[PDB]
Ligand binder design. Structure first.
Ligand SMILES: CN1CCCN(Cc2ccc3ncccc3c2)CC1
Ligand SMILES: CN1CCCN(Cc2ccc3ncccc3c2)CC1
Lengths: 349, 352
């Protein structure tokens, strides 16, 4: 349960924005509980009295999201219209009402289950074929990294620990290294598509009641960082996410495990599912040509995986200065940068 | 024939938002033409050279829309949804200064085409369809009297200089609009009308006659320009449309419209409209008792004609507000008086 200053707001929003029973519902009939609290993007679960029959096809239970601009909204509406996302039941200046999808999030170690990562591949490829009314020019990747790098070189921390950690990070010569990375990635062909850009296990729902479905038990959510971007980044980033488990209950509240990065075999298995789903003609290609393509895609995504480390490393340093959320951001930054340089050595680039 | 800045900015938007031949298009080979000028919602046609080949789906031609001089999230979300549902033009690009839309070969309707039976029948079907839609917006019917209240307040505190505008304003105030509003409200709050997703501005200039289709009998029109849309009393949407039968905005001299009260649809014409509307809006209707059909229709007419009074009042108030702030060449005050003339005349018609 929430505070008084809300739940009423939540009451009004549900009563005004939802059809059916919601329309005549009394403030004492309103059921609401917290799904995730905090200062920003708070989730809530609102529901009709179980003793209330629905008048039409309106939802019994809904997700309320409180922001705590225009593109984010257009995108969610579109994904909703195409059944790629939760339905959009209502939208307003300080949040929105979304479909409540009975489910849990994936856990890190589940990303490696052959059936799971085969469906994530298939879903990412599908996400990747969608037309969106947004800029098709791949500005996002280096634009965001420059934006973050510049912030980082302006960040001053008070406590000695953060100063120390920032100092060790700045000692990699991030500006120079960004240019080394630009060189590498420019010379690495990767089709521009609509990328989720944050395809981590916490954004993948296992839909309850089909945990037994072999190719249809997952849904991708949270598209807040989505944009047109190099394909290799969405895949590389997701592969990186195999190494990071955010459920750790002690500070810094994540574990990094480099050994958990997908093996070549595991990589070939993800992309062997991705490709058929991304170009429908791929399956009919010559056994030999498929491997030509797969070997190339492996080079492609493992290289862009470096951008995942670099971008989210920088991102993490900024979050440290400004976020309230309890999470060891600097240590995570240090982890992403270690994995960065470990991956460079591994690739010999 | 746009200005250097725009067309340069339009070239860029097109090249960066549109797929296919567009993305490799050079500036020297970019075609743009004006469809509407002004300061607010300029319209442009953009296209590929005729010698250039499309690579895939991409359109050969598109409409650029510049917003000119944050409810934009609502408009944009709406515009995008109607597109996904094939009810509006496709949405190719959205950005701070405007949007890229599908170009749809067509012309708009003339006022006197609104009364043509097939036209009127299809408009009624399209509107009913439009009304059945779920939209992620607030379902409380506050738009109508909220907006009028908003305009009335603005109206009460505007002072003109220019003599003729000053006189015209006072004659409108003569009527005691705050009292008159209150009692429009009482009249209407006693007039049941289903709350639905309304277009709210269904005038001829917002209805496309689709090219290639002037032969189809029930499928040659598309409603567009949903800028004023919202959940609202169905009666408003229909009443407002009926009012627009009376108003012709193609008139070339000041005040740049003709009002003709006597072009308002006859009862026979109104019945012909909702005879298409009702089977298009609800399922069983077609096969209800020919006795209950008539009960439904007759009440609806009282409903839509009563709400037509809100059309006159709302747009009259809006028009007065436009006279202060708008620069567009249009006799807003004269148009304000005409709506209010129709308001009191319609009131007289109804004995309310
Ligand atoms: C921007 N997204 C991709 C970058 C990695 N990820 C790190 C992360 C994951 C889970 C967290 N859970 C709680 C707090 C911080 C967290 C940070 C942040 C999410
Ligand atoms: C809000 N809409 C319905 C109210 C009447 N209408 C007045 C109008 C119609 C056409 C015009 N065409 C050009 C200039 C002004 C115009 C004003 C405005 C549009």
């Amino acid at each position: 349960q929430p505070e008084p200053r809300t739940r009423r707001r939540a009451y009004l929003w549900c009563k005004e924005f939802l059809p059916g029973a919601w329309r005549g519902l009394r403030e004492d009939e309103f059921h609401i509980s917290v799904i995730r609290g905090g200062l920003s993007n708070m989730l809530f679960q609102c529901s009709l009295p179980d003793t209330t029959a629905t008048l039409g096809d309106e939802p019994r239970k809904v997700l309320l999201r409180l922001y705590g601009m225009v593109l984010e909204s257009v995108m969610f509406a579109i994904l909703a219209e195409r059944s790629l996302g939760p339905k959009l039941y209502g939208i307003f200046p300080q949040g929105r009402l979304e479909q409540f999808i009975p489910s849990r999030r994936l856990d890190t170690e589940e990303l490696s289950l052959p059936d799971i990562s085969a469906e994530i591949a298939e879903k990412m490829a599908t996400f990747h074929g969608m037309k969106m009314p947004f800029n098709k020019e791949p500005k996002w990747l280096f634009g965001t990294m420059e934006k973050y790098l510049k912030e980082v070189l302006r960040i001053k921390f008070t406590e000695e620990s953060r100063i120390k950690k920032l100092h060790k990070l700045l000692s990699y010569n991030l500006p120079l290294e960004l240019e080394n990375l630009r060189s590498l990635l420019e010379s690495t062909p990767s089709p521009v598509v609509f990328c989720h850009n944050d395809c981590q296990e916490g954004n993948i729902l296992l839909l309850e009641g089909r945990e037994n479905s072999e190719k249809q038990k997952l849904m991708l959510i949270d598209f807040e960082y989505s944009s047109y971007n190099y394909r290799g980044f969405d895949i590389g980033n997701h592969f990186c996410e195999w190494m990071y488990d955010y459920s750790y209950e002690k500070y810094p509240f994540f574990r990094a495990n480099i050994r958990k990065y997908p093996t070549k075999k595991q990589q070939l298995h993800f992309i062997s599912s991705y490709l058929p789903a991304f170009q429908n003609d791929f399956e009919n290609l010559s056994t030999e040509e498929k491997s030509i393509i797969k070997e190339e895609m492996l080079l492609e995504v493992n290289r862009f995986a470096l951008a995942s480390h670099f971008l989210w490393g920088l991102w993490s340093i900024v979050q440290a200065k400004i976020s309230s959320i309890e999470f060891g951001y600097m240590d995570y930054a240090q982890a992403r940068f270690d994995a960065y340089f470990h991956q460079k050595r591994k690739l010999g680039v």
